[PDB]
Fold this sequence. Notes:
The complex is a heterotetramer, with 2 copies of chain A and 2 copies of chain C. By secondary structure, chain A is mostly loops. Chain A has no helix or strand. In chain C, α6 packs across α22. Chain C folds into 2 domains: 1-252 and 550-697, no CATH class; 253-549, no CATH class. Helices cover 46% and strands 14% of the residues of chain C. By secondary structure, chain C is of the alpha+beta class. β14 of chain C pairs antiparallel with β14 of chain D, so a sheet runs across the interface. The complex binds zinc ion (4 copies). One zinc ion (ZN) binds at residues 475, 481, 484 of chain C. One zinc ion binds at residues 23, 641 of chain C. Chains C, D: Keywords: Aminopeptidase, Disulfide bond, Hydrolase, Protease, Signal. Chains C, D: It is an enzyme of class 3 (hydrolase). Chains C, D: One of its GO terms (molecular function) is serine-type aminopeptidase activity. Chains C, D: Substrate binds at residues 191-192, 306, 631-633, 649-650.
Amino acid sequence: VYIHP
Amino acid sequence: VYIHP
Amino acid sequence: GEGMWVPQQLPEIAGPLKKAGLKLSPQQISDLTGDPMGAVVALGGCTASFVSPNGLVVTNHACAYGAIQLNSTAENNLIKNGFNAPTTADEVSAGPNARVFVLDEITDVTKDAKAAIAAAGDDALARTKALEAFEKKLIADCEAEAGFRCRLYSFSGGNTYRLFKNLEIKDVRLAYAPPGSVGKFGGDIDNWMWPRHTGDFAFYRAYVGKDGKPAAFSKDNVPYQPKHWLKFADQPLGAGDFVMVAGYPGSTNRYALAAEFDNTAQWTYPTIARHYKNQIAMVEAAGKQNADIQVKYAATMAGWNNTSKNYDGQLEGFKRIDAAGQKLREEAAVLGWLKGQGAKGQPALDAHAKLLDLLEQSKATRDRDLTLALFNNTAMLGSATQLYRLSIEREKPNAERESGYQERDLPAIEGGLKQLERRYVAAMDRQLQEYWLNEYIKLPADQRVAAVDAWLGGNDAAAVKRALDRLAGTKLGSTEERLKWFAADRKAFEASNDPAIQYAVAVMPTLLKLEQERKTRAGENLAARPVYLQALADYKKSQGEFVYPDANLSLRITFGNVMGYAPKDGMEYTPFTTLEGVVAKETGQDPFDSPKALLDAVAAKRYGGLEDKRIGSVPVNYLSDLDITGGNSGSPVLDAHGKLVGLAFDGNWESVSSNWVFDPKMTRMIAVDGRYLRWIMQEVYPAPQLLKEMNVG
Amino acid sequence: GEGMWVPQQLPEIAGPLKKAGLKLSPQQISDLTGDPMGAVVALGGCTASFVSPNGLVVTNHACAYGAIQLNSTAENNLIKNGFNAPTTADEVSAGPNARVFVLDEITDVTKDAKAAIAAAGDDALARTKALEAFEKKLIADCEAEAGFRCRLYSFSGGNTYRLFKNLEIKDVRLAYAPPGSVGKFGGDIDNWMWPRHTGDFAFYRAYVGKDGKPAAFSKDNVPYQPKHWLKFADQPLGAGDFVMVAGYPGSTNRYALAAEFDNTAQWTYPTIARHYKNQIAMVEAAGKQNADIQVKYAATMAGWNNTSKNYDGQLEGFKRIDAAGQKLREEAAVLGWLKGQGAKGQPALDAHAKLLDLLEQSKATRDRDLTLALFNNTAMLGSATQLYRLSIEREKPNAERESGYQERDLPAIEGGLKQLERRYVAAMDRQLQEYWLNEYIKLPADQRVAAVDAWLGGNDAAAVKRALDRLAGTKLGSTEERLKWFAADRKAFEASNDPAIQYAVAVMPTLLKLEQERKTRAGENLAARPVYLQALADYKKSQGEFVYPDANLSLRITFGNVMGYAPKDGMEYTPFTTLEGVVAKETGQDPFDSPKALLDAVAAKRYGGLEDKRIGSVPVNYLSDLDITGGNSGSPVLDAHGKLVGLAFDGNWESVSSNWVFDPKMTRMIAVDGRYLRWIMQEVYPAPQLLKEMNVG
Ligand SMILES: [Zn+2]
Ligand SMILES: [Zn+2]
Ligand SMILES: [Zn+2]
Ligand SMILES: [Zn+2]
């Protein structure tokens, strides 16, 4: 998923 | 492979 | 699409054939000894086709595997290296039992057959004996012309009988096989799967005497001159294009009682696959340590692996489509439908009751029957039982001898005993006897054989141990001892101290009685089956469903188009694979170890004039919605103009359960593209002379 | 296709946009506060958009996951059950740190920024401090207008600077979330994978004070009235159709030295992946036995899972395309090309050598630096160190306070201390402390920290236990105690007997020294980085390649078309998935346990007016060739007319290596179809109020 870590 | 049997 | 059409159904499929794209007239296709149907030949368990006027025959690597293995040793392994004969004089015998059958004539004999059956009235065993007697006489008459072999086929549960007459070519030679890393690329890992990248092809040549008549192997024989042979396509085959296959599918079980299904799914397939895997594991270990065992057992190993995986696949496919459920639910629907017509539908309903009872009967002894059958199929017990039984049958007039033991069967018997030399190692066979003795003792008391118990003298490691030690004393391990007993009389077998012969003599009465019990079961089936199956066909007709007989090793036509399938949502398999996909699976280790020449030619895009623009490479294998099954390997795939575009060789994983319940979305043929054949023979393992002979080099 | 294009590059993509099928004018897309671009908002690590005039905001479930989790308990678990506010008064706060940022203005400040840097002279640390001071002043000025938060961005290695001003909405509320088995269908098994069947959406509502101006949560607040909002497509999206995304991708490393790639692939990703998988294992095991741990750590666990799997996929994609070799050869080509330009190439060659030395300096202490940062990121040590550092910064004038510790950061700091209440269990944090202690102890002597070694007073399992037992005496476990310390002064920290505070006091001088080293290296990087990266840009352009900056959390546009991709020979992934593919994956066990209403509705073929006749079903997810990365989750996908056709949420497995080397053939966006959002909200977890508000019910 392209959430920002 | 469709050798019999 | 669905259907393994008999040639007598061509009027029914002529329109569908046109719609799918056939551009030959249905008339030209109805000529079974014409162009091109007359090029298509039976091998006995595979198909093949003539591809030159000098008797060149193409089939699969997997169909020729036997012939290849027979000709291999640990130090000259042809399976591994391939084979190429630069001149016809270099071609090697495919073996005494190898055959090419060229169709001569078909005759409907239905009325006669069921008259002879009816004339026994009402005794089950006698009914079987009467059909047997009728078949023998028919075949004896048909085979009066020297060089022909004939066969009686029962279609649709015994509603139709036809007699096939074939030219029996008995000198078959191997002309070419690609290395096994091409012929069987991907091995048992890619077997029954797509994406596939396997160059599954090989060539034979057919030989006859100098007088043109069939004859067994001799250097004085010359190539046969077929009346008809196939030509390679001149148009590139693509997605959506028309394809057809003509060939010899073996068996299907699409007309079956549900209980026949459940038995097969719950007992038959799991049991046989377990047994086959256990033997594979034994022979694999022994063969890692012993190259002689490895080459000698390679063909047996290919059969065990292929059938076991097929069964693993059918079981998985039953669960995917709930076959058990569909069977139940259509049986309900058919039985419901039958009573719904009172007097009319009463015979059919009786038949169902009968069949079901016969099934429970065969079920009562299934463990016994299978286990004894396989124990007796090990090399020395098989040889001794077969040879003893022959000595017994030889005492009767030839017409009363059991099928498989008449005069017309002597060549294949003697051939089998010679071929066994290349397929037997005593230390290996000992372990299989051991395996099957362990499985026998493991059986329940009601499931035992008195004669085998006594022969054994106990139920433990010790008895097994003594049995094995005893049997090791046989002389049947040599081809010459086997051929001696092939000629000996019954008295001589009964006088023998050979331990394997002693075993056969000990069990034969039991085997003959079991055989009588089967012939009697079959006799009742012969009454009930045709009625019930005619009803199933009638009901299918009433549902507008497709109606064609289960496969029975006779000539059938399937047609359709090149297309992939969708195994899961979000994906699709494409109809073709390509050269690049072969090299992508390269690991340098069996079974993904292509020849160097292949890897180099692919890296260099040497496409040899054979690239298809639409896929940007040379095609390797392709999917189509044809309806094939075991027996169809080697079948030529023809295009809209009857030209050769490939060879049938496999089905995709999800297809195999269609043996029982046909699924049109997941049922595809996997074929090797004629362009890949040509490509391998140009760039990888060259055979310039064969390409020239086929007018493509 | 490739490119995370800055708005200022619209002129250069106007042509390509039109050719791909955009029917809006480019000028219309140029207006970043107009229709539709002004609907697109940042969330701080995700993207979202307005979809109603009354402040309704749609994003991914993965983006709202923290908020959903903050409002969940073991007894009333909204991650599991979903949430739905039947009226706006039922909406729950998303948490004090939740934000919606609405773009107000962008300004180029490149000239001024670079003059501030130049004025520092030769010294690396002054150069960092000059840029910091520049940034703080600029931001202070920008933020003089109440309600606005500003951000300075560096692009292309310091070659361009722009300031963004955003309206900062500070009262964000949860309006709707589907159940977890929809929002995260397939869990971590399907994460980073196609085929994908995930309903990854949720809705917030943005609130402001009655005076129109941003405010923290209050029952007196009312919904924000956005200037622009998106509309749902009235045309069915199909394969090949144009799509574009605007959003906020976080970071890419496509401009990087070979050695920076090498270190990442060889050390950074495998190290982090291992540490994350180790912690996942402990927390998973504990949460199995304690439902309060399971719910409190769910958001952290989602992060660890998502990151570690992403890193695994990157490592695999590097091997698939030989990224190491690609980077080695590109760099040799740029260095050759520079050497070729004589004198005028020299400043970039020198920059390259300086960059490489700075990387080496970094590498010498990497294990220490990572291990200490992550030990200090457990909940109590993280709290203690952050709050002790704030008490130090509070004694300086605000303009001189470290960024993160200024007055403008106090809301976030405080909100984080409160949020942690729903994200901490002592017995879980202890195990995490223990993990990191054991990793610290495996560091070699030259990677150790005197302060931590002294505090530990030993190097074995006993000392570890004694330290954990000491830290367990902290009182920072409670929200009220953390807030006390949030306001306390430096002296109060240095007098404390709280053992976590004592740790912080003891290690703080060391953290401050490490920070100065990092600022020093950053200052050298300010000198070298823009010169080399400009050379890289110039070289790419001489090669005719696309030139756009790496992602840096600022607004970008990407565009392309709906299309699948080919992962290997003989197969293709189709652009869409469908409802029946969701059901096909059902197992009744997490993560494949869809809501019963979903399974019912699909079985009954209730498509709700949303069927796309071309796929035979309601579309669920789709692939396209857009160029997105972490931070794009939640971005609207627009069609040719600027209508909403989906939300961006993931990449396929093979795409993730594109962070370092872009592969056009295997790089796809995975988006959730607007129709599936609507279908879920009609048939499965109904929200008729929201559908009506969006004019689709
Ligand atoms: Zn034509
Ligand atoms: Zn002898
Ligand atoms: Zn239009
Ligand atoms: Zn206190």
